[PDB]
Amino acid sequence: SGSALLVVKRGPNAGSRFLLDQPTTSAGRHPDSDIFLDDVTVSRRHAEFRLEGGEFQVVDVGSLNGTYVNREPVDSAVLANGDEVQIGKFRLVFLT
Amino acid sequence: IAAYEDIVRRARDGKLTAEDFSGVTISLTNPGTLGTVHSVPRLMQGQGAIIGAGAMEYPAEFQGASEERIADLGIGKLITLTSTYDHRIIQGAESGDFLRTIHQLLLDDDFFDEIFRELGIPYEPVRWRTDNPDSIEDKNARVIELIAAYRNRGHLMADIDPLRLDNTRFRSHPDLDVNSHGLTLWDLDREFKVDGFAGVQRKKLRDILSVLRDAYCRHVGVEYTHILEPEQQRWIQERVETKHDKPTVAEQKYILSKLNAAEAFETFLQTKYVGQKRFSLEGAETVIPMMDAVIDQCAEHGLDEVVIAMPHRGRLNVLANIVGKPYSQIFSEFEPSQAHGSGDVKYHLGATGTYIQMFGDNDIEVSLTANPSHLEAVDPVLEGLVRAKQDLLDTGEEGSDNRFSVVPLMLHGDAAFAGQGVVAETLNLALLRGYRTGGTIHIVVNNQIGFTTAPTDSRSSEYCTDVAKMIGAPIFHVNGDDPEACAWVARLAVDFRQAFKKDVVIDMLCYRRRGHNEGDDPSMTQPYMYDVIDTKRGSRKAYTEALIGRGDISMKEAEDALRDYQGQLERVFNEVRELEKHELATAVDKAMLQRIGDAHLALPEGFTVHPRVRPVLEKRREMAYEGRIDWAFAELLALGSLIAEGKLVRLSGQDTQRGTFTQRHAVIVDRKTGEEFTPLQLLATNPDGTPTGGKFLVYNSALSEFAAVGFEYGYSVGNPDAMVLWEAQFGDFVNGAQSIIDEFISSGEAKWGQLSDVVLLLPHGHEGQGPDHTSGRIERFLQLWAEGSMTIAMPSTPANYFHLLRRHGKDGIQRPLIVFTPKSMLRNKAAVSDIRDFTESKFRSVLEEPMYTDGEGDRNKVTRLLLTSGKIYYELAARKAKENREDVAIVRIEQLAPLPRRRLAETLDRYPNVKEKFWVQEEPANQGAWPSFGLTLPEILPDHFTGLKRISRRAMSAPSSGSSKVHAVEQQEILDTAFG
Amino acid sequence: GFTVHPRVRPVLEKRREMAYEGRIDWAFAELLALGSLIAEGKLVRLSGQDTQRGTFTQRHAVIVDRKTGEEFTPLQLLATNPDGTPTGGKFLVYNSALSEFAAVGFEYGYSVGNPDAMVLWEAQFGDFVNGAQSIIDEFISSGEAKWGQLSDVVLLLPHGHEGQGPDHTSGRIERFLQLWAEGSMTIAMPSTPANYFHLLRRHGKDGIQRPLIVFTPKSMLRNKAAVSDIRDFTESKFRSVLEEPMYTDGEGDRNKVTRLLLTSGKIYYELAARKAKENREDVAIVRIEQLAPLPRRRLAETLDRYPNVKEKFWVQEEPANQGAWPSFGLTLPEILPDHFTGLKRISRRAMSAPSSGSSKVHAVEQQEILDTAFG
Amino acid sequence: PSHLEAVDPVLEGLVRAKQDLLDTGEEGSDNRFSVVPLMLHGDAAFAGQGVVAETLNLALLRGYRTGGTIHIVVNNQIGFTTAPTDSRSSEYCTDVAKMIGAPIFHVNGDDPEACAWVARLAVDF
Amino acid sequence: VRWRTDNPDSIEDKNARVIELIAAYRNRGHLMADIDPLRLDNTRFRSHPDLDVNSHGLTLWDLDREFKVDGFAGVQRKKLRDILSVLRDAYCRHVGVEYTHILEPEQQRWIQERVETKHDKPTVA
Ligand SMILES: Cc1ncc(C[n+]2csc(CCOP(=O)(O)OP(=O)(O)O)c2C)c(N)n1
Ligand SMILES: Cc1ncc(C[n+]2csc(CCOP(=O)(O)OP(=O)(O)O)c2C)c(N)n1
Ligand SMILES: [Ca+2]
Ligand SMILES: [Ca+2]
Ligand SMILES: [Mg+2]
Ligand SMILES: [Mg+2]
């Protein structure tokens, strides 16, 4: 609805909708993150869903089990509709 | 070399000070860098001598010949070492001897021994040996033999001890020393016809030794030669001998993330609480990702569940980082003595969770099972639980798709594996017709100690796991410091288990960080061992440095891992600090009986039945259509009705298929062919062709007691909706499995809550066939009975036993029913039952005589009251019928525990002219039911049982008398005492 | 040049003080009973799970050098008389494997192969004995009877209600008493270090081959109250029945007693301190050290003292269906009815397990019995 | 008693008691081990029973060692009515002995000359 | 013996096969021995290619040829029919030997001498 919707496919909280509609949406294994993806694999600070105009770059921020966009480890990637973004054991899908 | 690399690192980055240059007393130059053979350098003032190291190469003449030509003759590279010296102090003899001394070192053995010690290399260095003048054919058989010797005992010369306590195991082997097999460093570059060594039919000697090193001498000891199956040995060589690929940096990072949560969990547990000096998984944190690897592999393999049975050590760590339980459900109600204990009950309880593959595409179930403080006691219980779940899924042994999707992950202590005897019984039942689990993954966590008992004094074998070689189980002794190795070993075990369906043992050699007591410094008993552990580094932090040192990760990746360590350490400390502030019809119609009575004669086309069994089938057809049903047929009718209803029945015991006393005949075998026939399986199919859903599982157990009872108990836990029955040969042999009764059956439904729906048939009967062939010791069962924990019962009539099994099988309430089946009374013509008993009746916990209930009997005439339970009633009733003693009534207490208070109070109010009460039992005075009844009855029902007399055998230390003549006199003494 | 571990060092000097002054704890009393037997000339074979150092850091029969790693046995020094002559005795102390069935079966076979030997087997905790239940049921209890293989074995079983779990508290006495016949075994539960000292010496020098099942305490080893003076070890004998110290040696009035308490384990020390707090001179506590055979004469004579007793109680920490009550509550009013008729029981509720899992539950249940026997 | 393999640890305790008495074997100046345990066993009782393993573990400990033991299993290929297939998960019942590196000689119980040689050779080992 | 037409391989090629076959007979000599007096499983004798000579690239023609068998019956050279006769009488007769699984080397050497020798027939007395 004008912004990106991340829907978790694999994880304890599978089948859940989250909205990325801010210039900075935080994700990690800590409550100080908008999308608190909790698990032992997930690190305290993992990735950000920054919004630059009409672009969503999911950027890694010092995580041990990296951030895989379409099973591909990236540091910064312009996430497109239908991508497998992986944070530890969690695997969510991007929607436009 | 540390001071050399400091001077090199600083010179390279222009950070050298002038205080470094001032002080050169002796210098060295290398003109041989540019290929210049030798130089005559100029010596500067302030230096006594300067050494000009030449070009280390083959001489000019040989430069044109082939390498194969040179190595075949024995020509080697050389360095032209020069020493341009000052004649004002140093003379030709001293400088000439100085260079000779250098040569002696560069070709010495102790020089390289010292260097290998300083570089952390445990293996024997190459020695300067002058070429073996033997032919390649002569040398070939030596190289072939050396390859076989490395496979058989390569594990002995392996660096699998993280503490490096025995440095001699790396030098005390001539069967692995190459110099002994007629070989030198010159033969290193020659080809040998190694028939299928690393797959290649030809290989250079230096390749052959390096393969064997990385395969059997690195951090993985391989013991597989003792296996009798050949393809299994071929299979392990195809994995072990291949130069294994280095794991990806992403794979390595998952290992370090799993080790970060494990080291932080034990950091929290050794801080937040006290008394946790015991159960401290410090040093063996590597076992957390090791199990994770097994389960990740299992999910990839397409498996359904991994059932974990483990001891108290590091159990909470597994519950959070392996099972998948949140820290909240772990420390809810958590709890400083010098002795170790159980602490919080969570160390016993078994919870379930789910595992999501980090890299794979599947999800698998991970459950944990309950166990007491008795080490390795849960071993047969876990294999029974895994089998219960497999059978349920129409997979494994009892299924169309024999996959064995339930995998037993069993962990053990180092001294507990060779020590306990249950370990052998459990391995024996790992591959039986009705007990197999299709392999089991065993991870022994060798901490190289057991409280204060040295491992040397706890086993009579090289390895603790040498017990596993009973069933040809491959053993992989892996070093608990190298995590990458532990994961490979663990994942390879899964492949073997899935390929051959055989148990696999992984010996994880680690160290125990602290003693079992908080104020215990076990350096009193093992000072040398704990002196090494004092200077050791954590298996997570050490692996972190190794990844940086090897160039696998950078300092940015070192920050990603260090932030994850604090991020997971704070995670549990703050979650706990926040959670702390917020604080039935038991009978069937006669047509059902007639279906079971006809199943005994529904023999397959051409089934030649044994002539001794042949009339038993016809007699059961007559019994189901007329009456006088003996105990033997009543037993099968109770289960036959439950199978036709749709319930699973698992009856298995020592010689239970035929029957201990030739009474069951659940499986009859053809005399000519040898085929098996089960009449109770015919009931699992309704007359209209539709399957009922029930099943009959009848097997013959090994000569085991501890594991036979522990397996059936585990089956009633894994599948509660199953009539699990275990029959002993004689009740007297149950003392072998006393740990299963004391710790799992009686206190199971209470200590943890593991509901036991097991039935334990124990042949009990006083006939005098010896102390070990008469009493199943009822006194002990009653002694450990609490309000509603078990149901001890002693039936007297076949009809009552029928209702007893049907009642226990359809009550819903999970409670262990200990039935005491008779021995002689099976073939007793008096111990029979009519059809109206099986059809128009229910279970009777209290039983009056037949004359007072159905016949014309006078209850007032009774003055003498007799209370009994076993077959002894039939002897007392016949004695009463001989003397026409109408003043004696006999009441039976069928359900011994719980005591039928209401059923007996109402029954005792009948027969009002009773002036004396007696408890008549064949068992001795200190044994039987009197020690409990004589103290319970006048306390619970004092209006009738006050002043109760006892007519029984004299108190003995054994259940009965040895001589058969003595038993006849003692049995008649009680019959005359109760009738006089 | 034997560098002793600094954690062991003061325990060596404390035993020098205890032997020359008094207040001898259970740990030293255990070694004094065997130390006298070795110096006399008898073979002593004490071996069990972690028995060399001691399950609860109490034995120290073998001490190891911190620098070298050499073993030192102080009880082997007694096998040589001061005049250089060997006594003929020997001390055999080993650490058994994680075995139960064979550990108990081996020591039993040793007492059959050599009757003139003090064979002792110590479990880690009494609760783990159920593994070797076949050795107890078939070889020890019915050995001296079924065939005649005389068993001179001593089975030390750490028994004590502290609440460290069901598998770390009760060594199940109820079963030993249940399989006891007239003169087949000798079940015993000592309360004082001096009594245990005479118990071992008596069993080691009686000649009569009879298995003595001793229930050593766990917490009461380091209990400051559970001590013994030199006068007890020198001028005294084994006591199967034990009165309070105020009625026997101190100024104590036997008539003042109206409430009679009968006990056996360490629970006596809690009942005596509770009595000293409330100055309840109407409560007497008698201990039954030898549980089987029951000391009929020693107890009848003692029961005649304290004549103003109007109530009798059996106070045990063990549950109702477990402990000594299932046997005592039915034997005592049948053997000594002139005193034990109408005997009341002050104990824990009947459980299927020997104790409760939570440590908090044990503290409440242990205080419930102390208030019941003092009200 | 009637419990199979139950006397296994009792015999090894009796042999050790006599060895220590004779001032030979483990406890003494000599190391003869003059007492030899001749233990006979049932075919399914060797693999089927757990005591068997605990007993083998004691066969060579610091204060338990008997300096070897001669074990003669009488594999009659049956146990009442249970087949050896349902009584053991190994080729031989004696595969339990492999725990301590014990040499196993599967000899035929019809050839007496062979049985004597096998028995005498075991004594030498 | 089966009628097989000569293996055209050299003696060096055939040697490593014969060396390996000796060790194969030592590892599982017991698996094809006549130790069952009732002869219930007749297939145990034929269900083993590691002991079948025809499988190791050998024929009845190679039976009379010499092979460099390193210390088999002491002799560094032996005819194939002599090698298979020592192994038959030593392992596949009525005494199955499991001695290869032992870790001590001198013990294996000890059993090798006492097993791989034409043992004297016992006296009539
Ligand atoms: C059956 C049994 N007997 C005795 C004990 C007492 N006990 C507790 S720890 C221990 C020794 C530890 O041995 P191991 O299994 O190697 O454990 P780890 O040293 O690895 O912790 C013993 C004897 C026990 N727990 N279980
Ligand atoms: C411990 C034990 N459990 C059960 C029995 C009952 N029982 C009597 S004979 C028999 C089978 C005999 O097996 P095995 O040891 O092979 O005897 P063998 O004929 O070889 O001597 C069994 C189970 C027993 N005697 N001992
Ligand atoms: Ca049920
Ligand atoms: Ca004596
Ligand atoms: Mg250990
Ligand atoms: Mg038999």
Numbering used by the authors:
A (entry chain H): 52 to 147
B (entry chain B): 228 to 562, 567 to 814, 831 to 1227
C (entry chain A): 853 to 1227
D (entry chain A): 603 to 727
E (entry chain A): 353 to 477
Published text:
Contrary to most organisms in which three enzymes compose the 2-oxoglutarate dehydrogenase complex (ODH), actinobacteria rely on a two-in-one protein (OdhA) in which both the oxidative decarboxylation and succinyl transferase steps are carried out by the same polypeptide. Here we describe high-resolution cryo-EM and crystallographic snapshots of representative enzymes from Mycobacterium smegmatis and Corynebacterium glutamicum, showing that OdhA is an 800-kDa homohexamer that assembles into a three-blade propeller shape. The obligate trimeric and dimeric states of the acyltransferase and dehydrogenase domains, respectively, are critical for maintaining the overall assembly, where both domains interact via subtle readjustments of their interfaces. Schematic illustration of the reaction steps involved in the oxidative decarboxylation of 2-oxoglutarate with generation of succinyl-CoA and NADH/H+ (ODH reaction), with emphasis on the catalytic steps catalyzed by OdhA. These include the ThDP-dependent decarboxylation of the 2-oxoglutarate substrate followed the reductive acylation of the lipoyl group provided by E2p (both catalyzed by the OdhA E1o domain), and the transfer of the succinyl moiety to the CoASH acceptor (catalyzed by the OdhA E2o domain).
We therefore decided to produce in E. coli the full-length proteins KGD from M. smegmatis and OdhA from C. glutamicum for further studies. MsKGD presents an homohexameric assembly, which can be described as a three-blade, triangular propeller shape, approximately 20 nm wide and 15 nm thick. The E1o dimers containing the Mg-ThDP compose the blades, with two central E2o trimers sitting respectively on either side of the blades plane. This oligomeric arrangement as a trimer of dimers allows the separate E1o and E2o domains to maintain their canonical oligomeric arrangements (i.e. E1o dimers and E2o trimers) as seen in other oxoacid dehydrogenases, with their functional catalytic centers at the respective oligomeric interfaces. a Domain boundaries in MsKGD (Nt: N-terminal helical domain) and (b) cartoon overview of the MsKGD hexamer in complex with GarA (gray). Zoomed views highlighting the position of the N-terminal helical hairpin (blue) are shown below. Crystal structure determined at 4.6 Å resolution.
